[PDB]
Amino acid sequence: AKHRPSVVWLHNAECTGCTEAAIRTIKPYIDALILDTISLDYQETIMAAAGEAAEAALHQALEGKDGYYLVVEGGLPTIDGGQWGMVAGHPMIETTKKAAAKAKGIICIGTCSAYGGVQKAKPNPSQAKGVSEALGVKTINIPGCPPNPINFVGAVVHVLTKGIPDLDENGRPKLFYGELVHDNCPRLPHFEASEFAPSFDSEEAKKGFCLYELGCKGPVTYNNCPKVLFNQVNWPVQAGHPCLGCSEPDFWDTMTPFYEQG
């Protein structure tokens, strides 16, 4: 039986929403991916081993003859020598450094690992950093809070079979992040006609008017949400709610207040 490329997946300062997003994949489903396509060799959310047996599984994967790719979920807390975020008695930054060193490639799943994310938001008590900044290496960023599995699995499969996809100036694959949310929004004609809902209870809101006046950040947000949807059924603006700008770096501080354009 043919070798499957080794993937090591680390969890740092994260909410696990990115792991949850990844398993919402349907092309392929997650079982097919890990039985047939990759060898998922360390993943704290689902792996059978715990404790020293889990740490040994990690060790064995990092020492693997065939090498491995690294997926990082979460930012890195760096205050007090990295001690506010630890696994197996080791600072997260230290373990991520060790794993990244020999990685064939590094994919940052989510805005946290890509850019620092929610824990980096002002006043950043944990001195949290995105991976590229903590490690000083270029990363393949799949941001969003969480990203679409389409984008993450799409990037993983691209990296294994075709090489590094074309990246924008913020490390995001142009395949998925090349276009503004707003440019593909079904409410675009309302926006063009200056037909804005003034409140969520208004007749304008009931009629599906543009949400710009209620703070929609779609005009400054790069992502494919209106085009591919989430869970094959929906997306925030379709559900009547403004875009938060959640694929943009530092959105928690650049895109707030969420319900205003101020």
Q: Where is the binding site for [4Fe-4S] cluster, in residues? A: 15, 18, 112, 145, 182, 185, 210, 216
**x/- map, 126-155, ligand F3S, by CB under 6 A:** ------------------x-----------
83 binds another protein (CB under 8 A): yes
Q: How many residues bind ligand SF4 (CB under 6 A)?
A: 27
Q: What is the DSSP letter of 156?
A: H
- Kindly write down the DSSP assignment for every residue of 3-64, as one continuous string: ---EEEEEE-B--SHHHHHHTT-BTTBHHHIIIII-EEEE-TTT-S--HHHHHHHHHHHHT-
Cβ proximity to ligand F3S: between 23 and 87 the closer is: 23
What b/e readout covers 94-126, taking b as 16+ CB neighbours within 10 angstroms? ebbbebbeebebbbbbbbbbbbbbbbbeeebeb
| Residues between 186 and 215 with contacts to another protein, criterion CB under 8 A | 199-201, 205-206, 208
Closer by beta carbon to ligand SF4, 71 or else 211: 211
Question: In whole angstroms, how close is the CB of 182 to ligand SF4 at the nearest point?
Answer: 4
Cα–Cα nearest to 222, from 131, 111, 78: 111
3-state secondary structure of 115: helix
Let me know: does 241 contact 197? Beta carbons within 8 Å.
no
Residue 77 binds ligand SF4 (CB under 6 A): no
Count CB neighbours of 198 within 10 A: 12
Residue 114 contacts residue 81 (beta carbons within 8 Å): no
Question: Which of the choices another protein, ligand SF4, ligand F3S, none does residue 223 contact, using the CB cut-off of 5 to 8 A by kind?
Answer: ligand F3S
Stretch that binds ligand SF4, among 11-19, 64-72, 200-208, 228-236 (CB under 6 A): 11-19
Identified binder of ligand SF4 from the candidate list 216, 225, 244, 255, rule CB under 6 A: 216
Phi, psi of 72 (to 5 degrees): -120, 130
Q: Does position 74 bind ligand SF4 by CB under 6 A? A: yes
Residue 132's nearest CA partner among 148, 152, 151, 116 is 116
Residues in contact with ligand SF4 by the rule CB under 6 A: 14-15, 17-18, 73-74, 110-112, 117-118, 145-146, 181-182, 185, 187-188, 191, 210-212, 216, 218-219, 237, 243
Which stretches of the chain bind ligand F3S, using CB under 6 A? 144, 181, 221, 223, 225, 235-236, 243-244, 246-247
